[PDB]
Copies of this chain bind each other. A is one copy, B any other.
């Protein structure tokens, strides 16, 4: 059952990620101090263009300049993530990417987030906005066919940051 609740500490996670083409151990707690956009995508190497992970990567500075990091996660292995990264974009690969790719091979992370699909063995499109004190502020769940918008995510982040500081004015 899902552990993700708005207003509660986002469920702890840790696992191996690909970070600049190397295997690094990564933990939710590594992000304390900053806002974190933590999103799940269904699988590496499919025949859909990975335009949403690419979008977040390409516009990463828009998050980093407002104290926000981005982490992406699927149930693939770190070895698969690596291979997808080292596959040229023009070839359906992801190409180089500046956002970590977290592996959830055991499926524990996805279950903890309520994004796992029992019958498919992968996640749906799930996005989580977690604040600098590690509290969960926002949950977005999309049925598989529909992607997330970087612009919408940015709006939400800036809005949580505004109201953390100033309250709701009006």
Contacts and interface: CB of A to CB of B under 8 A. Distances in A.
A83 interface: yes
Interface residues of A, number: 52
Count of chain copies: 10
A158 to B, nearest CB: 10
Nearest to A153: B152
A168 interface: yes
Interface string A159-170: 110010001101
Contacts of A77: 43-45, 76, 121-122
Contacts of A104: 121
A145 B163 contact: yes
A82 B87 CA distance: 13
A38 to B, nearest CB: 14
A149 interface: yes
A147 B82 CA distance: 24
A122 to B, nearest CB: 6
A120 B106 contact: yes
A77 to B, nearest CB: 5
Interface string A47-64: 111010000000000000
A137 interface: yes
Interface in A115-167: 118-122, 124, 136-147, 149, 152, 155-156, 159-160, 163, 167
9 contacts: A7-B124, A7-B144, A43-B77, A43-B80, A47-B170, A75-B105, A139-B141, A142-B156, A145-B167
